[PDB]
């Protein structure tokens, strides 16, 4: 199924994913297309920061579901 | 899909910040 | 003023200080458990609207003519809002006072994406800034053009190393201007005129990229740039 | 008794206390398990801030309360 990933600045990101994929593998995934170390990735859905270990079907993240996908920043 | 960290870019940051 | 250097600076008679509006249930994002999700030495991060930013004594100010780098404390009062939320309203807020005060303010968002974001350090929080309040919109308006300008910049320089200064003014000139920025174009003076600060901006990103990923700093739009305005 | 702490990253630390203990106490048992110097950390409980010098039955908490942990960093 797809579901979508949106960032603080609106940007989205479409993913291919199946409900037993771990949020681990969506980070992996979010790495792949756009680069992002996975160490940098927060995940939010329903207003929760999302557990590695957990599956997309543990949350109910549906099909055309919608993750928040907030950075921890490299900074000087 | 290479390497692309996120960043901030600093607008100003008082003389008192050590890091 | 022994501070600042005319509007004031006001807030909801139910705002609270800095740590007690952090521990409102409105703003917890964790199932806490016991191993915990962040690190202790990352700051908590969430959005903040109808924000204010003014010295310690009452006067709104701006945070871009240098009084952050003479160490004057900037506070700053607003409602908190969870770090996911686009709901720029007071609506399911958390109104904070004498928040700070702000140690380092900064762009992010160098995504491709529509928003420049703007984003407050204190010593307990981050906040990353929606809509300002009516009082303070006339004094953040006047740097969000080059504000936008430097993300422009930023992301033309990560997708297009290869790139001429040429190039970069035609992507400069074709990008549509956000909404409430209140102009129908940018124009190569848009960069211009923000020379100083825009280079600024991209030599900061480059600084904090890890020392494995190619700099944007030494590129032929820069240089071009870096004579042709002047920039130290 | 037995109280707990909730940290803003997510972590619930549970603690042995007593209703004479001072804040500042209550702050040492928390550097005793998180490493955490007590100047750095703010306690919150039902909104209030709680202050150094009060003790937990100045406050009447009672056993199995929650408290809110707020950390402030040492420089910027
Ligand atoms: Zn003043």
Redesign the interface.
């Known amino acids: 199924m797809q579901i979508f990933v949106k960032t603080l600045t609106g940007k989205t990101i479409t993913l291919e994913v199946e409900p037993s994929d771990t949020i681990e593998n969506v980070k992996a995934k979010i790495q792949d297309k756009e680069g992002i170390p996975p160490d940098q990735q927060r995940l939010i859905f329903a207003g929760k920061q999302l557990e590695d270990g957990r599956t997309l079907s543990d949350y109910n993240i549906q099909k055309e579901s919608t993750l928040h996908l907030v950075l921890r920043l490299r900074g000087c | 899909r290479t390497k692309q960290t996120a960043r901030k870019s600093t607008g100003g940051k008082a003389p008192r910040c050590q890091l | 003023c022994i501070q600042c250097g005319l509007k004031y600076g006001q807030h909801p008679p139910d705002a609270?200080?800095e740590?007690?509006m952090?521990?409102?249930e409105k703003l917890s994002?964790?199932?806490?458990?016991?191993?915990?999700?962040?690190?202790?030495?990352?700051?908590?991060?969430h959005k903040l609207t109808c924000f204010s930013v003014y010295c310690k004594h009452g006067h709104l100010c701006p945070?871009?003519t240098g009084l952050?780098?003479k160490?004057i404390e900037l506070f700053f009062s607003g409602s908190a809002k969870?770090?996911?939320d686009?709901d720029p309203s007071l609506e399911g807020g958390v109104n904070g006072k004498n928040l700070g005060?702000?140690?380092?303010?900064?762009?992010?968002?160098?995504?491709?994406?529509?928003?420049?974001?703007?984003?407050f350090?204190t010593?307990?929080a981050e906040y990353?800034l929606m809509d300002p309040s009516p009082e303070y919109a006339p004094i953040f308006g006047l740097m969000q053009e080059k504000?936008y300008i430097?993300k422009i910049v930023?992301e033309f320089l990560?997708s297009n190393s290869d790139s001429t200064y040429e190039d970069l003014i035609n992507k400069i000139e074709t990008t549509v201007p956000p909404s409430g920025l209140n102009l129908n174009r940018f124009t190569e003076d848009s960069l211009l005129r923000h020379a100083q600060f825009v280079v600024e901006?991209?030599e900061?990103?480059d600084?904090?990229?890890?020392s494995?990923?190619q700099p944007i700093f030494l590129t032929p739009c820069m240089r071009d740039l870096i004579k042709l305005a002047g920039v130290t």
């Not at chain 3, 968002?109 to 420049?116: H, N, Q, Y």
């Not at chain 3, 600084?207 to 890890?210: K, P």
């Open positions: 609270v200080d740590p007690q952090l521990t409102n994002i964790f199932d806490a458990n016991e191993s915990g999700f962040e690190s202790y030495e990352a700051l908590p991060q945070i871009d952050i780098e160490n969870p770090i996911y686009d005060p702000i140690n380092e303010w900064w762009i992010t968002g160098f995504d491709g994406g529509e928003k420049a974001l703007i984003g350090s010593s307990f990353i504000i430097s930023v990560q901006q991209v900061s990103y600084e904090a990229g890890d494995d990923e």
